[PDB]
Design a protein around this ligand. Sequence first.
Ligand SMILES: NC(=O)C1=CN([C@@H]2O[C@H](COP(=O)(O)OP(=O)(O)OC[C@H]3O[C@@H](n4cnc5c(N)ncnc54)[C@H](OP(=O)(O)O)[C@@H]3O)[C@@H](O)[C@H]2O)C=CC1
Ligand SMILES: N=C(N)NC(=N)SCc1cccc(C(F)(F)F)c1
Ligand SMILES: [Mn+2]
Length: 159
Amino acid sequence: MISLIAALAVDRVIGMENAMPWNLPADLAWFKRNTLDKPVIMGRHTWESIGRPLPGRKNIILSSQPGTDDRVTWVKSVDEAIAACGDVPEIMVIGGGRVYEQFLPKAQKLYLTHIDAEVEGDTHFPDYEPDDWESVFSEFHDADAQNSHSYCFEILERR
Ligand SMILES: NC(=O)C1=CN([C@@H]2O[C@H](COP(=O)(O)OP(=O)(O)OC[C@H]3O[C@@H](n4cnc5c(N)ncnc54)[C@H](OP(=O)(O)O)[C@@H]3O)[C@@H](O)[C@H]2O)C=CC1
Ligand SMILES: N=C(N)NC(=N)SCc1cccc(C(F)(F)F)c1
Ligand SMILES: [Mn+2]
């Protein structure tokens, strides 16, 4: 099964200057939790942003271009990336703007962290049809000392 996991701020903004503006440790904890032990797929930019493999997970990187680090698996297409994962229960696309657009069509579930923060960005999450998605999990959280905004963890499974 393929899955997208992401954090959308106001107006589906997900990144800016190769970084998630807000600071919500609750979110990352939630990322770590739902990605742990599962193949994860991302774009070259998103790789350049983390700089070091994500631990206890197979890291696949989509790049039309050759491979610059061997601590990870490089692939040149979406088909090549899913195949690179082998036959596993769930595949986590921690994607990237463009990586989400290509994978959304094959996704069976979406892990969305909706952030009540309004920052500007140069990268958005694909504009998906809510109609053809079911809400199976949704937990709201007020802002606290560690997290300055209110957020909601949401899990959608394609109908
Ligand atoms: N808030 C969240 O949950 C998330 C936020 N982000 C944020 O998103 C932004 C980065 O997003 P974005 O710019 O869209 O980039 P990506 O990380 O998705 O990288 C896209 C790149 O990977 C390669 N690529 C993508 N698809 C293919 C394909 N089918 N075949 C071959 N190569 C492919 C290309 O690089 P090449 O030129 O080498 O081919 C392309 O430019 C940052 O701001 C980051 O912080 C990222 C993930 C989750
Ligand atoms: N709930 C979410 N944030 N979903 C994501 N898709 S966040 C994806 C990500 C981008 C850069 C660094 C990280 C790491 F630091 F947590 F590894 C994670
Ligand atoms: Mn159904």
